Structure formats: C-alpha cells, structure tokens
Amino acid sequence: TGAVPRANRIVQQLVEAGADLANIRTMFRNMLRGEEMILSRAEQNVFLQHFPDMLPCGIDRNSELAIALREALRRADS
Ligand SMILES: [Cl-]
Ligand SMILES: [Cl-]
Ligand SMILES: [Cl-]
Ligand SMILES: [Cl-]
C-alpha cells in the first residue's frame, strides 16, 4: 500500500497502455509545475486511477505518490 509499489503499478499500467515513458516523464514534470498533461484516453485513465483529483486540482509535487512516481519514471527512463 506504500507509495513506491503504487508508483511502480502506475508505471506498469502506463506501459500496458502503450505509453512512451520518456514522454510521460517530461509531461509529469510539467504537470508538477502546473501545466496540464496531453494524454491519450488510456494514459489519462491510468492517471485518474491514482490521482483522482488531477483534472480540477492538479497534482501536488510534495505528495508521497507524486515523489515516488517522479523517482520511478526517472529510473525507468535512465
Ligand atoms: Cl526540463
Ligand atoms: Cl474511458
Ligand atoms: Cl489526486
Ligand atoms: Cl502525501
């Protein structure tokens, strides 16, 4: 139930959905900066499973899950 295994599940689900992780990494960085992500329907649905308030409220860079996801995307892209 920890943030790290949850972030890993996000990455897993993004790959399943056909996402380009390099692109998601860039998008997500910008999202944390306050810029909407341009996602496929499938990619949006993954994000909504884990960041339910994202559309009206954005994503908080200080949240444990956002931190874990940024870490996971960086490691996967490296
Ligand atoms: Cl940058
Ligand atoms: Cl749908
Ligand atoms: Cl949320
Ligand atoms: Cl938190």
Query: Nearest ligand to the C-alpha of residue 56?
Result: 3
CB under 8 Å, gap of 24 or more: what pairs does 60-68 form? Answer: 61/32, 64/3, 65/3, 65/6, 65/7, 66/32, 67/3, 68/3, 68/4, 68/6, 68/7
- Quote the ligand 2 centre to 43 CA distance (angstroms): 10
The resolution of the experimental structure, rounded to one decimal in Å, is 1.7
Residues 18/44, Cβ–Cβ less than 8 Å = no
Asked if residues 6 and 50 have their Cβ atoms less than 8 Å apart, the reply is yes
Whole-number Å distance between alpha carbons of 65 and 21: 17
H-state helical runs in the chain: 3-16, 21-32, 41-50, 54-57, 64-77
CATH class of 1-78: mainly alpha
For residue 45, how many other CB atoms are within 10 A of its CB?
12
Residue 50's closest CA among 16, 7, 20? 7
Interval between CA 78 and ligand 4 midpoint (Å): 25
How many angstroms from the chain centroid is the CA of residue 41?
Answer: 14
